[PDB]
Amino acid sequence: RPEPVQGHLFTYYKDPYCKIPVFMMNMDARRCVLWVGGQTESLLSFDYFTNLAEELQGDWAFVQVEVPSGKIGSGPQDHAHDAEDVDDLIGILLRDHCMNEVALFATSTGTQLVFELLENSAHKSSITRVILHGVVCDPENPLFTPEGCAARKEHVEKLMAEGRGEDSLAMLKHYDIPITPARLAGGGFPTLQEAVWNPCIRKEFDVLRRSVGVIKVPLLLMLAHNVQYKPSDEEVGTVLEGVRDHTGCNRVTVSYFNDTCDELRRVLKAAESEHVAAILQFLADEDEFRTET
Amino acid sequence: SRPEPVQGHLFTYYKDPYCKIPVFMMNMDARRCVLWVGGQTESLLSFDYFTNLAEELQGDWAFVQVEVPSGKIGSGPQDHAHDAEDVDDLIGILLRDHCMNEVALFATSTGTQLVFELLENSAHKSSITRVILHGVVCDPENPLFTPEGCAARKEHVEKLMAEGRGEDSLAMLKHYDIPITPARLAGGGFPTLQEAVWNPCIRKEFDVLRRSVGVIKVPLLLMLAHNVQYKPSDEEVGTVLEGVRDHTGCNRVTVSYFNDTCDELRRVLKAAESEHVAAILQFLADEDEFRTET
Secondary structure, three states: OOOOEEEEEEEEEOOOOOEEEEEEEOOOOOOEEEEEOOOOOOOOOOOHHHHHHHHHOOOOEEEEEOOHHHEOOOOOOOHHHHHHHHHHHHHHHHHHOOOOOEEEEEOOOHHHHHHHHHHHOOOOOOEEEEEEEEEOOOOOOOOOOHHHHHHHHHHHHHHHHOOOOOOHHHHOOOOOOOOOHHHHHOOOOOOHHHHHHHHHHHOOHHHHHHOHHHOOOOEEEEEEOOOOOOOOHHHHHHHHHHHHHHOOOOOEEEEEOOOEEOOOOOEEEOOHHHHHHHHHHHHHHHHHHHHOO | OOOOOEEEEEEEEEEEOOEEEEEEEEOOOOOOEEEEEOOOOOOOOOOOOHHHHHHHHOOOOEEEEEOOHHHEOOOOOOOHHHHHHHHHHHHHHHHHHOOOOOEEEEEEHHHHHHHHHHHHHOOOHHHEEEEEEEEEOOOOOOOOOOHHHHHHHHHHHHHHHHHOOOOOHHHHOOOOOOOOOHHHHHOOOOOOHHHHHHHHHHOOOHHHHHHOHHHOOOOEEEEEEOOOOOOOOHHHHHHHHHHHHHHOOOOOEEEEEOOOEEOOOOOEEEOOHHHHHHHHHHHHHHHHHHHHOO
16 A cells, blocks of 8 residues: 655636636656546556556656546536546646646546537647556446446436436436436546447448547547456457547557456556556657657 | 646545545645535635645645545445545545645545534544634525424425435435435435534534534644625624533634635635635634644
8 A cells, every 4th residue: 555645736717616626747748648537536546646646757747637527516517527627737737837747647537527628628739648547347247238328328317307317326227437417418438438438349431530530639548348348359459440440540559458357347456567568658658759859 | 817737746545446535735735734525516725715725734734635436326325434435545645655644634625524423423533633623604594494394494304315216416405505416415424514514503402412523532723615695693702612612522612704705505606815824824723722732
């Protein structure tokens, strides 16, 4: 278990009954990795973040924000309004905190905010990289079957109709990762399951245009799954090709990690060393492909 | 005008292998700490003045902040006894792992619910040497706090809990003012100083006070605010002072009023920043003096 890590804490105002805390490490750098996560993820959600930040020390800063919609009484806020809040932070970092570029790093349902931001951000030229982590399952899982997707859409529309958009427990048979109906109701792509895995295996190319297509800068996908699910080599090839051919940058990396996951697509224990090495090397390799000039 | 980023140390402790609880510590060179817990919608550094507080305390008390687990989606949803328990686990960690020799517990908003529960059941009661509680109060005859509105809210919560709607704070909007989950109301206790102090003192319900301020066996600062439209009489202020003094489990209780700007839903819009800092510092200082004799 990590020792307490030093850094700087501030909040910025959403409305004036909602302050959003931001924890910044190693700001002596001229640029930052900005992490946003799932609704049930906390600052330092992954213990390896302390190691990540420290390895990045001198090269990249490490900044963490807690998603407003992870908190009781946020609205309840959808993915577009949370993305809006993260965009205002990105602006604060660029303008007030000497950051020249940002690598967006999203885990779990944080990846929904990133796709939303990448097509609508006021700061697109400053978001130079994207890192996305996700736990994937079989598309034939009843959750992600055509019927499963339709029943969830309907269920969410009814919950919103009853004014029950903040009750993640009302969502427990129609989805796996904890999520509010309100985050589901706005659209977009909750996780890499909807953004990458399902559309690549089913060859849904117009869906992929809406997701990875909007990413016009280097992309790292970090994929995990519960031991039970054994993606075919074919499926791994289809996903690699589907992502490369349809991302808006040609520089995509797709890596697989030995994270321990439950049967509901949450990481219990990350492959510590693997995550840190894949991130350091992705940032350093894209540092080389750019300085090619 | 708002605070620069503040330096401190961040860690998390496991509540369970899915929820980790962040804790932000400042100025741990001291050998004791003020520990803050708040309402479910209150974030780390909820009050801008906490930066100034921690600064003024530096060298004397550390300043530690935890986010209430039930403030997060996916918490259970957790009632007040379990939140309290999680806070008690942090107190234990601070005592053994961070050379904290005493803890001043500081709660704002519905965080106060946890403090009363803590103080009666803590494994660490000997190390909790001061309590500071802040609340916004309204007229008890407000339709939320009349005998009937209490019964109506009590019933409404029972109904939601039976539906499995314990996490749905939006379902509580007509039956309570401050944002709160049904699950937090359902376990009982005293959500805020309205229920713990104001209502029972004005209504001379002194048995209730034994369960609230009666469990507090160390010096207590009560920090009271109200919206400008509420004008408590001298008599009612007197009855509240009398009730707290006669029924707290320790004679060293201070009851102070603050010129906080509050809306009509018992939320602080702007703390009287200088008043809060000064009252907290003077309370901590005066109680050190009292204890040193002899």
